[PDB]
Amino acid sequence: AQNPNCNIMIFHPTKEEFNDFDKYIAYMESQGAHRAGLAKIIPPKEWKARETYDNISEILIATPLQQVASGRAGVFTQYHKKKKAMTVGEYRHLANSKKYQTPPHQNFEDLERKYWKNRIYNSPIYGADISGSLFDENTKQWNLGHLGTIQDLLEKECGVVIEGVNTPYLYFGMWKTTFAWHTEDMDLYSINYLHLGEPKTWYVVPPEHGQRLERLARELFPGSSRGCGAFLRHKVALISPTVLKENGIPFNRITQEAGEFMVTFPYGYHAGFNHGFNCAEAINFATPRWIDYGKMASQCSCGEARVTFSMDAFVRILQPERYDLWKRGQD
Numbered sequence: 001a002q003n004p005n006c007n008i009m010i011f012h013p014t015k016e017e018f019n020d021f022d023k024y025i026a027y028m029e030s031q032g033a034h035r036a037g038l039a040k041i042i043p044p045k046e047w048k049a050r051e052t053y054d055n056i057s058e059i060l061i062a063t064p065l066q067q068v069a070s071g072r073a074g075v076f077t078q079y080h081k082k083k084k085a086m087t088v089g090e091y092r093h094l095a096n097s098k099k100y101q102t103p104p105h106q107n108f109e110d111l112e113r114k115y116w117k118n119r120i121y122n123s124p125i126y127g128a129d130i131s132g133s134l135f136d137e138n139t140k141q142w143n144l145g146h147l148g149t150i151q152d153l154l155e156k157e158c159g160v161v162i163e164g165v166n167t168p169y170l171y172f173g174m175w176k177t178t179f180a181w182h183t184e185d186m187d188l189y190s191i192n193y194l195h196l197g198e199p200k201t202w203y204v205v206p207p208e209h210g211q212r213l214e215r216l217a218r219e220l221f222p223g224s225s226r227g228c229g230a231f232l233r234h235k236v237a238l239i240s241p242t243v244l245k246e247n248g249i250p251f252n253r254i255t256q257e258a259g260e261f262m263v264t265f266p267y268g269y270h271a272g273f274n275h276g277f278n279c280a281e282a283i284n285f286a287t288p289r290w291i292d293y294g295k296m297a298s299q300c301s302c303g304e305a306r307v308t309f310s311m312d313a314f315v316r317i318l319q320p321e322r323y324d325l326w327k328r329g330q331d
């Protein structure tokens with residue numbers, strides 16, 4: 001078996017290898033990349049997402065989110081307080097202000113230490129889930145707005161035609177902005193391109209060990225667990241690497257820098273934080289191997305999760321027994 005220790009693998013495709021997206025994902029899996037839950041892909045030197053990022057300041061962040069923490073330094077939840085709209089130019093200025101700017105630090109490890117020590121005492125503002133793309137329409141390779149759709153994948157694999165669309169989302173981050181422990185909707189893959197700015201550090205649990213993380217989460221957030229059998233779907237819980245280690249949870253970590261792609265694999269729990277002002281673009285996607293994960297994906301039916309229109313068809317076709325209960329949750 002390839003990659004039995006479930007290490008995060010890093011790939012350096014040639015420009016020829018970068019032509020066929022599906023083929024390269026399959027190649028990465030043939031090398032065991034999926035066992036980690038996360039892979040890094042460094043694009044060939046000849047490739048670029050777009051010409052420059054000089055003209056992005058007028059993009060609107062309609063609903064910036066202030067991420068307010070509760071709990072202890074290594075075990076906390078965050079809730080999102082809506083703030084007034086601001087442009088990317090305004091957001092960048094805010095990120096760089098004394099209140100929000102990245103502190104002096106020696107290296108990524110030093111910054112990681114500072115993050116886990118001090119995150120809860122601040123409330124950074126995140127521009128998340130903004131529908132759009134920064135890939136040039138003429139970028140033919142690994143253009144996140146030009147991927148085969150999940151609806152077409154489901155149709156190709158299972159013969160059923162379904163409604164729904166899936167398009168990319170932009171994320172504008174600043175120091176300490178945080179993504180909580182989660183897998184993707186319907187345990188899909190995700191792909192994330194860091195377009196510009198400071199790094200993003202990721203933590204990931206191998207898919208074969210996801211239930212170990214779930215069990216610890218139930219222990220650490222007992223009220224939340226009683227409220228919902230899939231409360232990690234709410235995307236609000238954080239657990240530090242120190243606490244994971246103390247509890248014997250298998251995980252890995254890696255830092256993504258501008259110009260790099262990360263792929264998360266079905267049922268690969270991940271969490272992380274931004275180092276400073278940055279912009280990432282991400283989208284969910286599927287492959288034939290995903291179908292079995294989609295069929296088995298846990299669902300939130302307590303009403304907290306609240307998912308996109310397109311998830312309806314996924315649950316309806318892949319999980320017909322769960323559909324009625326889940327749909328009651330959406331309404």
Ligand SMILES: Nc1ccc2c(c1)CCCC2=O
Binds near residue numbers: 084085086087094
């Ligand atoms: N349009 C703006 C300008 C500044 C700010 C906001 C919106 C909300 C976040 C806090 C802030 O300084």
Ligand SMILES: Nc1ccc2c(c1)CCCC2=O
Binds near residue numbers: 129181182
């Ligand atoms: N796709 C995700 C997953 C987690 C999170 C976000 C988007 C933004 C809101 C905060 C968070 O933890």
Ligand SMILES: O=C(O)CNC(=O)C(=O)O
Binds near residue numbers: 178
């Ligand atoms: O970048 C972020 O804030 C969160 N991204 C993801 O969880 C992802 O790409 O799957």
Ligand code: NI
Binds near residue numbers: 182183184270
């Ligand atoms: Ni994700």
Ligand SMILES: [Zn+2]
Binds near residue numbers: 300
């Ligand atoms: Zn729930």
